[model samples]
Structures are given as C-alpha cells and as structure tokens.
Target chain A: TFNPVASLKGQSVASAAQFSRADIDALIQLALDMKTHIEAGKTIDTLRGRVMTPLFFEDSSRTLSSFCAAMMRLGGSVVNFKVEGETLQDTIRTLDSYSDVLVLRHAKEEALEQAMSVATHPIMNAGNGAGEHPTQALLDILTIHAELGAVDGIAIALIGDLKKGRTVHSLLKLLAHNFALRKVYLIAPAGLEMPAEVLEHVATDVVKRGIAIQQASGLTPEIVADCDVLYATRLQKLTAFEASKASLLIDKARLAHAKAKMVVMHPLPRVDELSTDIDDDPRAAYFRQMRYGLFMRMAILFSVLSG
Target chain B: TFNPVASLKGQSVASAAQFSRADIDALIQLALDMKTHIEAGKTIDTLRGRVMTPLFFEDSSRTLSSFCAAMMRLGGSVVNFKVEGETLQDTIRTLDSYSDVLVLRHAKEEALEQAMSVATHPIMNAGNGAGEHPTQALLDILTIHAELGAVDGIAIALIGDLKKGRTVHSLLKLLAHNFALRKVYLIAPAGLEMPAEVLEHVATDVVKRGIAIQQASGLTPEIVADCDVLYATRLQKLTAFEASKASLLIDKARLAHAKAKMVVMHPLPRVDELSTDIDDDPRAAYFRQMRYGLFMRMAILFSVLSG
Candidate 1:
C-alpha cells in the first residue's frame, strides 16, 4: 500500500540510492496513471499555477524537453536559465524564490551537492556528471516494468562506456538494491568497465537480493539471448577507444537471438554503439522509454510539488 | 483606433520597422491591461494550454527570464533547447510541430530569417545578432509612455555603443516614425557612434516630424537637464574604447542635473556606463523597464497566440 504521508513530496531527487523499492513502485504506478489519463485525450491540471525552472549548465535537448513537456502536460509552466558564468550555488539561489522546483543538469559530479546546499526549492537531478541520473534510472525501471510486466526476476545487459555511463550506473544501483534481478551482465570494453567504487558500494545489496553480477568484454548474440533487457549507452567522446567499439554494438542480427519478450533500451542521443536498423522491432523500447520518461517526470514533479 | 482584425495574431515579430504607430499603441494598451490584471493578483488563462519553445542559441538570463515569466504569468508553458551543433533551420523545424510559438535568439544576424523560412509557428525574435530586438523596443516604448505620459513631445538622449545597440536602434526607429519627438541627441564616443546607414534611413521620418537630431561627443549636465528620457546602454565588450566610458556614465551627480520628469533607462546588463548610485532614484526606470517588459511580452504572447 502506498502511503500519501510517505510519498516523495517536497524532496530532492539527487541520487538513486535515495529511492526505496516502495518509492519506485509508487512512482511507476503514478506514471502509468498519467499515461492512461493522457492517452484518453485529456490534459492534466494536477500542477496548475506551479513553475518549474530547468537550470541546465550543460547542453541537453531530450532530457530537458521531456521534463518541460511533463510539467506542461500537468498544467504547469517552465522557465529556463542558461548557466552562463554564474556559479551553481548562485544560480540555485536565484531560482529558489522564483521556482516551485528546479531541474538541474551540470557537467561536474559535485554540482548537485553545491546546488542543494543553497537551493530552498526541490532539486531534481537531470544529470550530474558521472555521479548520478536518478530520474533516468526511475524511467528506465518504469519502461522495464511496462515492457516485461515486472522489474523482479529479469536479466539485463548494460553495454558500452559503463565507466562513464551515469545512466547505467544509476540503473544498476536501483536494480541491485531493490529487486529480485536474475542477472546483470556488466558488458563494456577494457577501460570502460563500471567503476570499482560503484560496484563495491552496491555489492552488499546485490548479495542481499541474491542477484548475479557478471562482467563481459563484448556483446554477443548469446548475451542477447540470455537477457530480458539490453540496455546500451553511447561511448562518451571523452574516452572513445577505437579498437573496442565494434564489439559492443547491438545490430539487427543481434536482435534475432534475443528472447521474444526482451526489450532493447538506450538513454538516447545514440551515435554508433546502438544500431538504428532494429528501431522497428517490437523489442525496441528506447523511444517508448522516452515517452515513459515524460510520464515518470510528470509523476516526479507532481509528487515533489504537491502533497 | 485599434482593430482586432489588424492585430499581431499569427504574426512573426522579426523587425521593428514592421510596426506602425497604431500597432505600437494597441500593444501598449494591451500591456497596460495585463499589468492591471496582474497587479490585481489574478492569473490569466488567455493562452491557457499554449506552448512556447524558446530556442536561444545565445545565452541571456534577463531577456529570457522576462519572456518566461510573462508566458508563465499568462498560463502558457515554455520549453527550451540548447542549440548545440544544430543549424537554426533544423532547430526551428524540430520545434515547429511541438510548439505553438517559437521565441528565438541567435548570434547570427540572419538567424531569424532562416528560422522563419522553415517555421510554421509564429517566430518571436528575442535577439538576432545586431539586427533587431523588437520586443525590447516595445518595452522601452511602454516604459517611456508610462513614465513620461506620452511618446510625443519628448526630448531623448541615446548614449553608448549605438553602432551595435539593437535596442536603441529599434527604439529610435519606432520613435522617429511614430511620434513627434522634440529633439534627439546622439551621444557617443568616436568609433561607437550610430551607424550612418541607420541614421540615414530614419532621417526622412526624423526631418518630417521636425525632430532635431543633435550629435554630441560627450554627455554634459545641460544635456541631462534638457532631455525627458536619458536612455543609456553599456559599451559592448567587442568594441570598448576605455577613454570615453567615464564621460558617458550616469552617476548620482550626473542624474541630479537631469529634469525631475526625466527617466534614466538602460536595456540593462549595465557595467560602468550606468552607476548603481542612481539605481535607487525614481528616475532609474531600467528595473521598472524589466517589469514593463514582462507585461509587454505577456501582451505580445497573448495577442499573437490568441485572436
């Protein structure tokens, strides 16, 4: 049972570690409700008269647009500030009185901490460098549950630049901590493996949930056949190893080996690591993941802004 | 007389030269309506479900925030996109289907033309290089009307970086063509004086209205005492001649010599050209200009988005 008193009201979503299994479940349920309501050709007035200020220090289109659409769909409005030359603390302080909630994305890992220290309003981390993207993880979980019917007892393969992939890092932490996950194949090239610090931190939770964690060098058809979710990410330009890129790609041929119920996902702006050839496949859920993200963020904004 | 049939609805505000006196008068009247409604502590549902996508290629906190606040105040929503590596054409096209209106600001002089060629939705030019900032002019006009009782019979001083000050260029064109101004003082340093092309173009309107066009190398106390509106702008960093800055500044002493009815205005982001000491004076209308801008833009969005 979801308790209104314990709902994610007036809270900052800065880390995946902050969400419990119950919180995720409640959020997913709310997201599905939003989807159903929207699909019925109705607009929501849930957050009428509220303001959402998206203060993004880094450039982002998809995540920023998704949050804006979410807020707008709920009968709320958005204001944006280009963090030009202003410190994150100053920016956050300036936005606090003007905004009901502040959605932040910055290049530095410590940006969220700095913003939260001064912000009086709720701060939703769109992305904070390599540190965390908790909302992305929440949407990823929502897409998983929607596509496969449940989050528990599912195998997932996280491919590409895991070392710097904040999305995969956040997703893995959420999956490991709160679900009965069958397996997690940490697939990446040599230097791009998930950080030891992150892996070690989630080790206790993985052990408690009896979830198997496997490290793999490349994505094979056999790997596709074994997993329910193939979560791929682009190799960040900062450290692209030319030699290992081809081994990590998921093409149309790889989809042939995947289970019929399996879903393919990528937190997008994809370059070469995820092939567009399989975009038409029923298993391809990245676009649907974006749609789910809109609803999930609507849920987040509503929960945070209202009682 | 204002006609609804000749309203700014479904129009692209790309140039200051497009507006006639009647259009400016109608807009100011509507801005006054919005100010009254807002001051009465009521929110407007005029553009209730509309979406505004502000695609600012250049970074600006003040102008962008003013437009956002105006839109939000009128129950409309705003979406933002950071123009990273995408052509203005592509960005406008992407936003066309999703947005009801697109407010654009870019570094290129021809960006608005490029965007308007592709965009089906109304394109509001926030700024485009040194070309035109029509809304800024509109707000400046509204501030002058509110502070000085009328745009006619007023002697005004235009100071600083007129070669590239789009606000002054737009505002001057509006005043010269639409109102019978008593005198116009073009006060600037040597190189940064108003371009001959702009002055020559507006010369016919200025001469026909019997408006005296006086050019000055420096600001004098007599000049301050004579004008009804002392419009100051910052020396652009691109062409700052350090020697002339002190002579042009409006400090408390310089402002003390100004006419009691004279309003000191700056389309701001002020540096040394406008002193902070004069900021507390009632004659300092720049901050109020920002507030009037909020209402003016609300009028613009409401009129353009509505019938």
Candidate 2:
C-alpha cells in the first residue's frame, strides 16, 4: 500500500486514479516546503539538467502557466512547442527525443493515449478534452489543504458546469482518492448537474469509502452557510439558465449568508459566477489558489520527476 | 578583431548581421565547449537564477523548444506565456518583468521588431514572415561545422523556397559575416527564388569577401555531386516550379547522382523533397542537423545571456 511517489517516474499521468492519498500528502508537503523556499529565494536543483516540454495542443491558461513556473522553480526548463512542426507525431517525436518529460494538452480525449505510444519520455496530460487532468486535481486538493488546513471531514460544494468542467470531474475523484469528506455538494442548475456516469463512478468508488455525495440545484444560501468550502465555477451554458439568476452568480449580498469561517475558491478565468466585490473578502481563497497552483505543479514535477 | 561577446548581451538578435565574424567564432566555441560538457553529463550553473521566456506570437517549434532546452542546460528557467494577459503588449510586459531573455516568434516579420521596442529583457527572433531566424542560422552553421569540421571556403548548395525560407536567408548573412565561402548556391524555381534585395545585401557583404554567389533554378546532378554541402528546403508556393520538377525534391536516385562526400541538410519537417531512402545514406546530415540544432541553441543562449 506504500506507493512510493518515485513510481510516478517515467510514467505518463493521465488520470486521477494514478494518485493515492499518500501521494497527495507527499506532493502537498513537497509543494508547501517549496513555496517557502521560493519565497526565501532558494532554488532547488531537483530537475537540474532536465527539460520538460509543455505541448499545449488545446486551449489553456493557468494549467499551462503554472507548470512553466513550477518547472523553473525546481531548476528545470520548459520546451515551447508553438503551433509548429510537420505533424503531431513529429512534434511529440522531437519533444520526446530532447526532453526528460512531456506535458500534453489536446482537444481530443484520447489524443494523449496515441501520443504516449510514440513518446520515449514520460507524458503528463495537462488537459485532454473531457479526459482527466490529475495535475489540476492535485492543485485543487492542495488549494483545499491550504485553505482549510485539512480536507478530512470538510463539507465541500462543487459548483458550475459539472458536465463539462474536467477540473471538477477530476477533483471529485481525487477528493475521494485522498480525503474523507463528510459530504460533497454538486451545485449546478437544472440540466447542468454532475454527470450521472460520473456520479455512478463516485458512488461506487468514493461513497463506499465514506463521503456522502449530494446533487443540488445551486449554491443556495442555506448550503452556503452549512458548507465549510464554497467552490464555484462560471455557468458555461447560456440557453438554459441565463436571465440574471442570483444563485447561479454569487454576489456580495450572498456572502453575508455564508459561514464566516468558510473559504470560497474558484478555478479562475471567472465569469459572472464569482463576483469581483467578494474578491477582497478574507474567505476568498481563489487568488491564493492560483499561487498554490504554481507550487502544486512544482510539487507534481518533483513527485513525478525528482523522486 | 577581439570583440567581447558581452557586447551582444542586452541586445536583440533580430538579424544575423548583428553578429560579427568574431562574435560567430565566440558563439561557435562556447557551444562547442557546452556540447562536450553535455555529452560528458557535466552540469553548468552559469544561469542559475535567471529565467528566459519563449514568446511565440506566431506558429513555431524547434527554435522555441531548442531555446528552452538551451536555457535549462545553462542553469536557467523559462517563463510560460499562457497566464500572461491577452494583448501582445501584455504578454511581453509579463514575460519581460518575469524573465531575463525573450525568444520571439511572430507571424508578421515586424512583430519581433515591434516586440523588441516594448520589452525590458533582450529579445531574440525565433522567426518571422519576412524576417531572419538568427538561431536557425546558428544551428545551420553548427551543422556545417559538425559535418565538415570547417565552414571556411566551403561550397553549400542552398535549395528550395529562397523567398520564404527565412532560415536560409539568415544563414546566408551569418555565413557571409562569419566564414569564407567559395560559392553560395541559391537553388529555387522561378517565383520561389531568393529575393533580389537579399541577394544585393549578400553581394555587398559576401562578394567583397571573395565568396561567389550564384542564383540557380534547381539542383543539378553536377552541382549536387560537387558541392561540400547541399541544403534543401520545401516549396512554399507553386507555378514557376511546375516547369522544372527535379530541383524541388531529392531522392535516393538523386543522391546516386550526387557526391558521396557531400552532405544533404534540411531545416526539417521535410515534405516532398527529402526521400526516406536518402535518410539512411551517410550523405544525410538533416537528422544529425536537428541534434546539432539543440547545441547551436545552447550556444546562442550562452552568448546572449552569459555575455
């Protein structure tokens, strides 16, 4: 059961299942330590003489940027494969032949799988359509750990396009894999609720372990007050629920109803869902989440590569 | 002519002529030293705390990736541009603030020229629509040196789209500045041939150095078999090239007609021209060219940053 994080070396991380509770703990500690070192102007040579290429074949931002900083913080360099080359195969071939690790973000779900077949180096999925992003999940968990200081027994609500938000989907699985959540909230309006297949997977895998999963309408005032963590994402669909719904978008007024001790987090590029007025609130941990994201990636690179 | 490479520090490599013969020799020697150190598994701490960013505003790969690796090998990190704000101005501002060097790739040739004006860090052009790729020119030099052990008085056949193959143009200027070439062959079809403006510039600089420059339609067996280096590129366009087809592409049959001592080099992602059969031939330096490219890039980084 003792999965040494070193096992991740030379392996492509494409799923949340690849991570264990112990692995998360190890990574969190590594990043937590790295954060302080970075602030103190300490640079590690963990990945010295190594190179990591971030092949963003799909659209991205934080996941892309955070990893770049993370790689550098650990004394490794990033390869920039701009929309160039003969083909995907050729691009990956060149990157693989040169770098120690490859990070892939593809629009197609199984593109990472095909890419892995040709790559001589380890390839981590930055994002793969609706496929898993374990690194995102890792950072999300790290954010929660930073905010609440513990993920065990926490009342957590996941709000937004649960159907399309691969980050939340991966986060749900990682939460189950790593923590003992008392109750988990899936808050989305009408047709935008968490996928039944995902829920079923969670029921079989996570519910049996301990956490109670609940399907909800939105981030209502009552749930906001009860939950220890209020996590929100922008409502991506327009047609179904768009005529200025209050619950769909959290305003400063809604914060008055929430628990004072609770932390509000958002995987940003935020839309109307997260009100800017609430950003100044001490409970708002999202901006801090971005900072943690950088460290979390450094932790991941360390866990997968340095270990 | 003892020009210190330090003069190049804090300057942009927008053109190959920015480098003098002394500068080129300094770079070549620096890279040559780095290559051996890398092969011996020795690590450098020259750029331990610095960061370089590859800001590709246009499509790119080798120059970008190679620079990333080059920076890493020299003990530095790369700043990722994904999280940088929306505008080109914003991206440069962020990268400039966070990094020490910027490797730019722009769709428009003037994109680099524009970016250089705004950047706080030194900017190097990866490539541009009608501009030079100094780094590519550097690698081409390295490839020639690796293949023949000398760049002086060498006969190099420059084939393909001379109009748009920015790499070859940069190479021409760099070669003119750095070494003594006996004759530089520009092989292209009618409309696809090297620009008159470029040729004029080459003539002024190179012809004065006793290097004979000729404009040719395509690669003939006579020249192919005779030249020390046969460099081929792809067709970026059509029409005039439709008349004389043999010059555009190279095959095993073509190699049989060419010199056994001559090496065929391509700035790869090769299309129709380079046959896979010729890949196995000892005359093919294109693949080895890519490897030398990595080292060439390392040399550039050292020259610009270490200086």
Candidate 3:
C-alpha cells in the first residue's frame, strides 16, 4: 500500500508535527517490506558511497548502534560521534563537511531545530528532549497495529511519569489522529500527573469526537485488563515522588493476573522502576520494541534519502 | 631491486624476527629511496584508497603523528584513536574491520600479540611496554649509517637510565649486530645501571668479535672528544648518591667542551637532564632526529604497502 521510493524525496523528519497520517502508514508499510527483504537474503545496497553521521551530544548506546547498523546494512558508511572530543560546533562543522546525512540527538529541547539551521546536510532528529521521539512513536504504533487487529476502538494506558515521558506524548498525538479510542486512562502518581498542554490537546481531540476519558492514580489488575496496551515509563526528576513509592510500582503478579492480551513497552535505559526479571514475560515487548526501532530508522533513512 | 608489490602482501611485522638480514637491507634501501623521492619533486600514491588505523592506547606523540602523516602523504586515509571509548575491544574490532592495516601501541607488553591472536588483518606493533621499539632502533641505526658513512668503526656513548631505556637497549642490540665500535660508554646513576642480560649480550658480541669496548659511570669532556656519537638520555630515577648529594649535575657546559663534529641526541620528552641551551648547538641533532622519525615512518608505510 506504500510507494516507498516516492515517499522519501528531499524529505527530512525533524519532528512529529511534520508527519501526516498517510506518511505514517507509508513508513510502517515500508518497514514491513524492508524486514521481509532482509529475511529473504536480499542484500539492499541502496546507499552505497553515501555517508551518514550519527551525532549524539548525549550518551546513547542503542540509538547510536542501531542507526549505525541500519546505515551499514544498507551499504552506507557511517561517521559516528559516540563521545564529544571538542565543542559541538567544531564537531558539527567537521562532520557536516564530510557526511551526506546527519542523525542528531541531544538533551536540550529544540536542539535539532537549532542544528538544522546551520547544518548543510539533511538532519534527522533522533531525540531532542522531553519533547518528542517521533521515530520511536512511529515504530511503536506500527508494532501495536501488527499485534492487534486495529488501532481504533482500543484503550492505551500510559502509566508512570506521564509528565516527562516524551515517547508517550508523541505517540498519543499520532494515535489521536489515527485511532478512534473507546477510553483513555491517565495513570500516574498524585504529583506526577500529565502536563496541562498534553491533557488539553487530548481532551480537545476527545471532546471534538465526543469520546470518553478516564483518569487514575496508578495501574492495577482491573485497570491493566481494561486496556489493550500498557505504555510504562521510568520515574522522572520533574515528578518529585520517591522511586520506591507504592503509586509508581508495577506488580508483576497483578499484571499476569490481569489476563489482558496487552503489550508492555518502555523507552529504555530504564533507571530502576522496571524490574529486569519481568523482561522475560510474553507481554514485555521492550527489547523487541528496540528492534522495531531499527526497522523504523531504516524506513526513515530510505524515505529521506530517496527524496 | 626490491619487489614493491610482493613485499606488502600478508606481511606480519610483529618483531624483527620476521625480517632476515637481506630483508632489513632491502627495507632500509627502500626507505632511503622514498626519502630521495620526497626530496626530489616526484610524488607517489602507492596506497591510494587504502585505510590505515592508528590505535594508540599509550600516548607517543612523535610516533603517532609520524604514522598519520605517512598514511596521508601516501594518499591513504587514517583513522586515529588516541584514547579509549565505549569498549576498547569494539573500537579495535570496528577499526580492524574498516582498515587495510592497523598500527597499535599499548602500555602493556603483550598487547599487540593478544590483538594479533584475535585479528584477521595485519598488525604492526608501534611499541609494547619497555620490551621493544623495533622501528625506533631501525631508524636510529639507519641514521648512524647515513651520518657517519657506515655503522662499523663508530665510537658511541650510551648515557642515562640504561635499565629502563627501551630505545637504547634495542639500539644497542642492533648496533652490536652490524657495527665494530672503537669504544662504548655506559653512563648512568648506579641505581639505574644497564640490565645484566643486555650487558651480557653486548659483552659477548664484543668479546666474540674482539672489538674494543669501554664502560664508565660519568661523562667527562675528555671522553666526549673520543666518541663519534653521544647519546644522552634523561635521568628517569634518582640514585641513592644523587638523592644524598646535591652537586652531581649534567649540563650544557660539560657538553660544550666536547668535539664539535660529534652528534648529540636524545630520545626526547626530556625533562632537564639535557640542558635547554644545548638545543641550538650544532652537535644537537635530536630535533633533526625527530624530523627523520617522520621520514622513517613514511618509509615503513610505503614499504609495507608497496614493497
């Protein structure tokens, strides 16, 4: 259903707000095709002689490695900056002179936008701040649709520090456009409620569609069973609750007893709230979610480069 | 008469062990020829499109810069890693995968051997602990041969920390193999005397060939007049006598009274053992020695790639 070649011409994915519903569908379809092509022993040297620079101001193992792997897999060479040896301007100037595309990730919000103003090459915002992780949102939605029959008429419980979870906020915006949700549950600690802007946006979408919305203090067995998707996040510094607090905890036993065919996801490097022992559970799709991240990146690469 | 193409293939320069007498001669001749080529207006691009990786865990500014300059001069690309990053193994492995040849320098003794055990590509040991600096010895011997017209019939002084001076030890072994010296002086603090194994080897070489040799603790202006080469080294560690007495000093005034034609050199990173005033003296060939180092590395790179 996607014309992959036509979708990626002179195009740059700098933020989540830039994508239309059709573009998202095209990207997901292209990712599925790429996965199939890789499985079929067909080597795609689409980006040979092309150079991709993975520039990260923040220390990121998964984002750096996966993006490098995706570029190399497509027969493109990568100039990666895992650590900053000098000033950001100097590094950007040097790498921009040599590379064709730059994959940028920094801790500051709107940092990629600022970089894009000066960068000669097309810039892909890997992650800016607690603003948006558009690619992660794309892959997550793709994974959801692949597991479930539809995105519409489904409830997603965004549990944990919704106040600072960029992934959840970005995904929520995407879902608001594509899905006709039955109910939306905002699960968090008392002090760590969703930001007013995010709440207003979701509430406006719901009010426009005459859809119901629910709010809760924490996740429980009944609440978990009520949702088709469980998006878990780590305890954030902005949300001033002790990490060991009862409201922030996810009981594995209760989650298993919920009996909901739900997918549990986390935007990783998860500090401490998520237990490692829970990683092996069938519903724990965090690791697999990382793999989807690769495919999603590959799709974005193809889209941007082809254009 | 060296076969340039045949010399480069599958050559593992782990030690001087892989090189025969004829091979060493050929390499030296090739080096001299390359030096001549550079001196002339001719340019050579034997290693075009090739990539060289300089992996230095130990910082040796002189050696590292020389190798990098050599690669670039030959129209080859260089990927230099001066320090460790995410994983040393991963960085080495990735560099090895990308490069045509790898030059490694580590503080640990058997680091090169360990790397070679796992590496599929050719590995050149830049320096391994205080054990061997083969290239330095080679270049020093070549310089002596060029300066004095021959390696044989040369009077030399081995000064300073003989026990820990890896360059001096290796140079002595190499000189013993090719030269018939008039006299040899070992000048150092009693605590930093030449190691017994090195002394025994040099003594045996002199005795077996009936060559004249002399050993001494201190340098006098009279002894300086008798030597063709005065190799001074920094006092790495203090002797008990030096620790107890404050008056034992080696300075430029003592060196100034020496024969004007005699060459004075130091393996640098010198800390005041050699006086700064001596830097401008005609006999001070150490700075010229540094420039020769760059050429020596260029020679090695050309020989290994185009031999």
Error of 1 at B137 (Å): 4.3
Tell me each candidate's RMSD, in Å, in order.
Answer: 8.5, 7.2, 9.8
Best of the two (1, 2) by TM-score: 2
C-alpha lDDT (0 to 100) for residue B56 of candidate 3: 82
User: What is candidate 2's lDDT per residue for B1-307, written digit by digit as tens?
Assistant: 1222676776777877777777777777766777787767677778878888777665456666777777777778777665333667767887877788888887787667668768888887887766477777777888888778889988988888788776677778778767888888888877777888777776776867898887788777777766899888776545555566666678888887776667888886776677866756887888667767787777676657765
* Clashes per model (N, Cα, C within 3 A): 0, 1, 6
TM-score of 3: 0.59
lDDT of 3 by residue, B220-302 (tens): 77777788788877765452745622222345777766776677777677776677787788777778776666666666676
Off by over 4 Å in 3: A1-110, A117-120, A124-307, B1-8, B16-18, B85-88, B202-204, B239-252, B255-260
Calculate DockQ per candidate and list them: 0.17, 0.40, 0.03
TM-scores for candidates 1 onward, in order: 0.60, 0.68, 0.59
Error of 3 at A299 (Å): 14
Q: Put the candidates in TM-score order, highest first.
A: 2, 1, 3
| Alpha carbon deviation, residue B74, candidate 3 (Å) | 0.9
What are the per-residue Cα lDDT tens digits for candidate 2 across A13-48? Answer: 888677777777887887788888789887786777
TM-score (chain B) for candidate 1 is: 0.94
Backbone clash tally for model 2?
1
- Candidate 2 Cα deviation (angstroms), residue A262: 4.6
Residue B12, model 1, lDDT? 90
True contacts kept of 2: 0.61
What overall lDDT goes with each candidate model?
Answer: 0.82, 0.76, 0.69
